Amino acid sequence: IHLQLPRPVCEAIIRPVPEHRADQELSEIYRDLKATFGVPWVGVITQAVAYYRPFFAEAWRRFAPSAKTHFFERASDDIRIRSWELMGQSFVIEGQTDRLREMGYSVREIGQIRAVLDIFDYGNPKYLIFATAIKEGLLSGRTFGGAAGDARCHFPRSPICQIDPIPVMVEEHHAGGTLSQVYADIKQTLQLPFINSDYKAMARWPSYLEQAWGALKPCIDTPAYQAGRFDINARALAALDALPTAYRMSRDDALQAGLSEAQTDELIQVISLFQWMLSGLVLNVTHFKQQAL
Amino acid sequence: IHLQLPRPVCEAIIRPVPEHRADQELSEIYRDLKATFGVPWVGVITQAVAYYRPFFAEAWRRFAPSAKTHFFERASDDIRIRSWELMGQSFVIEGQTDRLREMGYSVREIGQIRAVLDIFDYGNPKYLIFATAIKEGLLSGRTFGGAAGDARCHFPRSPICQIDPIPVMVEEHHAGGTLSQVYADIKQTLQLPFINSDYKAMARWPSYLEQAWGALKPCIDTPAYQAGRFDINARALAALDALPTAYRMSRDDALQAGLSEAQTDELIQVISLFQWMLSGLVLNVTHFKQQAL
Amino acid sequence: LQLPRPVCEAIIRPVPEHRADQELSEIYRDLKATFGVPWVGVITQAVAYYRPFFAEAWRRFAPSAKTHFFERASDDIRIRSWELMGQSFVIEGQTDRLREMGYSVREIGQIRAVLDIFDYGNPKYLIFATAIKEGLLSGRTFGGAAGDARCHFPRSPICQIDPIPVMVEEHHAGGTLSQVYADIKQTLQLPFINSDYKAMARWPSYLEQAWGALKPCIDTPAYQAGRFDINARALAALDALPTAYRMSRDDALQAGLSEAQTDELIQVISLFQWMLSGLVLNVTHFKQQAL
Amino acid sequence: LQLPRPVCEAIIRPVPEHRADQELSEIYRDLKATFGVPWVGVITQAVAYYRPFFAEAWRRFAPSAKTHFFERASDDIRIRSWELMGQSFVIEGQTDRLREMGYSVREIGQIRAVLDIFDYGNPKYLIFATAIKEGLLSGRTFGGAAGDARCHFPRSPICQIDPIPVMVEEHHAGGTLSQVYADIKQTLQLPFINSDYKAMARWPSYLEQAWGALKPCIDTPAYQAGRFDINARALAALDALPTAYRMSRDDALQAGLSEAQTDELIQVISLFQWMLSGLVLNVTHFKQQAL
């Protein structure tokens, strides 16, 4: 009837290691991840995988060569583009700029809000593709990519990037009552046990987040949203298949790296949920950005 | 029975021009103020005076030579020191670092909170002395300072400073729900129609502000707080008398700058309230800082 | 295949960012923000002397600059340059030699990051320079076709616009540094020193090294062919601008320039436009050295 | 009054910030954050070679460094230097000549901000160097008296620590810059180039100018006398440290150094401690030139 991306089962407890808690050793991997993706934040996805640290270190080591490439840059960008395309076609997204002005937001402040949205509009596809690699590698045991056709695919990615500062994020333990209820609403509506970095950064401006989320919420899990989400997911799987450097990181690789059988089961649930989440997050950020046009 | 600083009458509307709204010309004055004070934010006191822009520009022009001096640095610093001294002596201020940890705050986060408190602990004395200059100059029509004394008083101040970026502040139009309630509580308790930059910056961590304000609130307008406040105000007055470069900015000077009689009356009420406010703010930040030791 | 240097008797008058007044600095900021780069090119500094033309040219060009199309066409020039220099030249790695000179791993990383700025940014300036020159010379209207709707989408968001890279300006320069600059000017046939070399000059012994290895490649047959190819890419980009660009001699008059000033501008932009195809190759060479 | 240069056979082995490993970098960071300065002095880079001693000495000195007393005593040294150079020399302004060389208002602003960094921080390094040296030479316990309780209060909090100043390192330098560096070494009797001159060297023509104006003042009678005075202030600051500092030869042994390594350290710190009184005067001179 319409394409619907099924949410996986996750009973595993999720234990993200935030940047402000990461020890020196973890922080160096975090630094490399941000420098390579060219983003100023470590994804909650990668924070959660990092709990299984030796797996995280090895999976990053193996994925990183592909992430440095022209191919990966383009594949990520094309997902941003597809999202923009879908949401523009399927939804009448009224602009919120006048409404924000009426609330008292100045031109500069709205500019700052846009800039925060741009960070995630750029970065999230990269996280989506990485999460997809981690999940599919664990589930299938397959070796992905490394076909090396067009030589330009292996060229270095477009070199510029913003890696500082970490965006201002209102963590759950920072948050007061009213903000906690918006977080609760987002969690329930999106079927997640965590608050994404994106929403926490928007929450630097609580009345903006309330507005932006309130306009998005009715679109969630409409047929068009759901079909679009499925499409974004398919794009991410297609990118995994075309990685310029082969990626393999199976259960046995996880065991080799020092995970137990039980941790590996747990990790599979954790990454599956994050991977599913990420196609939705891409569409959501696109919606926010188009609202603020 | 004990020294207490009378709150002036202000029925005039306060119209601060925030840094995110200031036009090009005002922003240049704002930049010079920050560079000269050595602080990363424009005070709400100076924002409110800036509404009367030709007065603000001429008053800053006349005060700036003094603010650049070794004297001003030392006099401001001595007010910080006096405040530290008074609050230490008069109150049993229990450390809140353990509670913050229990609430989920990391070592790095608590460090960031302290850094924010330091900005205001350093800068507020300077704003206090300036507001005192503006108020007394208008009320008295007197010429303050300019005495030949110790040549070293005219030397450049301690040269290092911190002027970027503007602290993250949760503006009233940013706030939602419970933060506005905390803001309401602060306004009513401190008898102010506005929220200070200091509390808007603490509000970056709403649960921290709630704790810090809760611990401070019972101290407000105890005899010891009030007597301390009076002493801080007295130091401010003494500093004005010893400015190394003479400052005069009377009603007549205000009229010559292009203010109307009615604007000058309004400005007098406005500055009087801020001047009064600032002795209290200094004690409050000291309290926060000692809590967070 | 060969790009002949144009004739330029006109004096070039860059307005550096550290001298630009408030109004001009606002246009400079917008340029940087849109291109997503931390520096104002000497190309745009020189055109800024003709301020009413500069402001209107930017006004007309900026809508295209903000697009996916522009991001991709600029990126494809960088890719092509990488491809050409890789195939056409044996470019020996210089990292070992840098280390032997006392450069640490972190310093070499810093040097690479400076190179990446220009590697990214120069194609954008090249296309803009091409737009200005051909607009003036031909009076034609370039681009503006609907075509693929995605071409008009906003470009890939993220950018680095601060700080301005540390540049050793000519009046900063001492004796031997002035001599490297003179050599560069002579060899490249330019009356000015590019931002690229000035930034490299923050590490004088590094600049000498890198320029040293590049210099014998300049104006070899393969370099010239490569340069011709890069120029052709810039012209193709201009023909496919998603938003129409027209800015003729007559438009220059309407913007506030006199006829004589327009004629001078034409000489100035022609020199810079020619220069930029070569700068792209040169930075690509530096970058491959530093691999 | 005169201040003799100590004998120093020892090789000085600074560990620069761009080479420091993770462990040392954390001490460097705490040093900068406590002093409130954006660079790690060469004094501390050299002592860092004796890392077990450096870590313990800093551990012992840091509680004093954090205080109101230390902020004031350091500041009073800056003031005294300002005072002395003002009285003892006719220092001609150089802003006009810099402008005439092509420096803009903003560039001269940037130059002044760099000088301010060292004007602020060098007295702190001087006092620390004096503590290390005298601790080792005398074996005494310095300070630790209660006295005025305000002396133990935390220092004026605000600080600029964030970007390391751009410094043209000796291996960055080529040609004529290496000559100016050699002149500085010979004139000041040092085997190294201070962070302050390396930062001024970001503008090579400015450094030549500023050094050229200072040089005839070096080791005149009024300069030597002022230097002696600055040294004596540092010694007084040490005697009044709010928290006791003891770090003897025996402490050096307990910290992990051998006896021979301690003998060498004593030579190294003695040379730096002597250098620092001179550096304070020099930066004061630069700063008054640039008014």
Curated annotation (Swiss-Prot), chains C, D:
Cell cycle as UniProt keyword: no
Gene Ontology MF term list: (R)-2-haloacid dehalogenase activity
Catalytic activity as recorded in UniProt: an (R)-2-haloacid + H2O = a (2S)-2-hydroxycarboxylate + a halide anion + H(+)
Keywords linked to the UniProt accession: Hydrolase
EC id: 3.8.1.9
Any Pfam family matching the protein: DehI
This protein's record includes keyword Hydrolase: yes
Family as reported in the entry's similarity comment: Belongs to the HAD-like hydrolase superfamily. S-2-haloalkanoic acid dehalogenase family.
Protein purpose: Catalyzes the hydrolytic dehalogenation of small (R)-2-haloalkanoic acids to yield the corresponding (S)-2-hydroxyalkanoic acids.
Subunit structure: Homotetramer.
Protein name according to UniProt: (R)-2-haloacid dehalogenase
Lineage of origin: Bacteria, Pseudomonadati, Pseudomonadota, Gammaproteobacteria, Pseudomonadales
